[PDB]
Symmetry: C2
Subunit: 348 residues, 2 copies
Amino acid sequence: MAISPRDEQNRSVDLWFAYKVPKLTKDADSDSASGYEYVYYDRQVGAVQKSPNLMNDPKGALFYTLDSVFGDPGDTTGWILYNDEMPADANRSNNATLGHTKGVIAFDIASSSALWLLHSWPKYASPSVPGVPTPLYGQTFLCLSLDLATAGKLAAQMALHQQPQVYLPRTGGLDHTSPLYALTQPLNASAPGDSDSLDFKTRGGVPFKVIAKNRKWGKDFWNDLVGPTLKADMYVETWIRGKIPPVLDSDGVHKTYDIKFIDLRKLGAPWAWPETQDHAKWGITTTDNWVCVGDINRMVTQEKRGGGTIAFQDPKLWKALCETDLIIPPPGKTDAQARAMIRKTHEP
Amino acid sequence: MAISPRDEQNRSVDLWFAYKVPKLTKDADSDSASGYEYVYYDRQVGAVQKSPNLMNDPKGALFYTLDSVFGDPGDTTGWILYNDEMPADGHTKGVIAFDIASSSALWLLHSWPKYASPSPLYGQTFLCLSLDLATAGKLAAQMALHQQPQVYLPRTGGLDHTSPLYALTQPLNASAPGDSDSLDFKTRGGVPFKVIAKNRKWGKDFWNDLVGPTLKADMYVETWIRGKIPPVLDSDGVHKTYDIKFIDLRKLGAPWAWPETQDHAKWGITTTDNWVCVGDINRMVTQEKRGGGTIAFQDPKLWKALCETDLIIPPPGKTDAQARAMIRKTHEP
Ligand SMILES: [Cu+2]
Ligand SMILES: [Cu+2]
Ligand SMILES: [Cu+2]
């Protein structure tokens, strides 16, 4: 069958999204959340809802998607794996100058089909080691159905800008002139400028943009590249973009107060957690329903490394993500004072 | 004048210790602590007390000590600035300063003079010891072999190239047999201390597998944060950072207590025999492969003050025992 994202029932789907929760504790003897629970979204369900599965189960959209690639590949099935922190079974040291971008491009040459999985797990994925990695952080996933020509145009962009660190690839007999093949070879090309944006569509016709920075980029990825590219403002007002010092409590002791929380309780996932326990590599705009899922988090301080984000319009998913904000002030402070503390992390 | 630590009143002193507080917010208008306030200790005062100074003022033991070395050095005065950054292919700083004509020296842990890194966030310890030139040389020989620090802005002061202090300014190529080393020294005032070092081969627990056994006393680690506590449930599914372990100076006249995660935590004490340790290595289980070490000395007064800085605050609905179990869970690999 044609390479495709698989949904929660192991059926082909054009696009899916997941938001995985972090590991969340009651005490030393039990957890509220293991860190493998998640909410799931695609356009056939049409709503963001808590999944009955855990991401490390041998079921659910993540497992079914990757098992349909790694499980029993045909002779023309192949994949490009990349991560700035390679998994142990690559048995290679990391090149810190390469892109800080993570994902899987899988393809089948005979059927001219492909898929792209974006994730933010270090040391993932492996084509032969089972399971999933660290459960400690909130994380987002996006999985897109592509044709082979689109996968190749994406691979051509990555060779120049994102510059992913590729490991354990399978070529599936690719012709060596393929841009997908070139992504398995050393990346040396010089890039024009410090950023690049390209328009693509899924096989099902869903438009998306891949907005990429290269190692020469030094400005604000979100406000100076993504916003301008989308012709919209990023909704950054309540972003944690730096460290907040401890604050005084009424007992005379200073404590960590998170202030900004991410809250999935309206979506059926009965948890809320500090934004500092979240990879926070997603963002939305204030208008036009853009949802961005990618490699780059919200911190002002960034390494000069390649990477990017995927942007697409989706009113349902936009509204669900918009309403996950939760602001809790430190003791004695107002909502207004709490929001000012968050904004203070946006300055140098 | 011979090289010597200087106390809060710019008098020569054999040894002094300081604990600087992190920057701590009161509200949008003011900080409870700027991050330069500190408590100070030496054996002349005989108690750990809040200083009236800010550490970055041109007053107080740290400034007076540094100014006595770098402000107007004599022709045979020299120094080695070092840190534990990895060699060439956010780090612990120190200074060894010396004067050949007077055969005098001092060792300052966790600070450099301002000009070596010009312009508060975290709690930090400081220690300064009076040494003779021979002892400073034996310390430098150990560092060339084991800790292998990176060296910055040295001044040789005419040292002979055969001196181990001079050797510390030259490329460090040694590769010792064994993974660690310990040496005994004394200050000019006669206070014994040990320097306990690991080199880059060391892969075990620095504190429990090297320092403790070397001292023949267990490190007091039971309430150490040695890793990350996940967010903990408050109510209705909202999980928050509960620090659980705090460092509390309020019994010492310094009105601040803060999370141990806002502290460099490059110090420890033993459960018996009053050992105080200040060094390069923090309390985290996860450690990079690199040389480094700690000073250890006995001090009943300083030990008790540091012991009593423990503050445990359980998350809501939890007992003290449950809180301590959550702290101990961070000790797992
Ligand atoms: Cu990196
Ligand atoms: Cu070729
Ligand atoms: Cu000679």
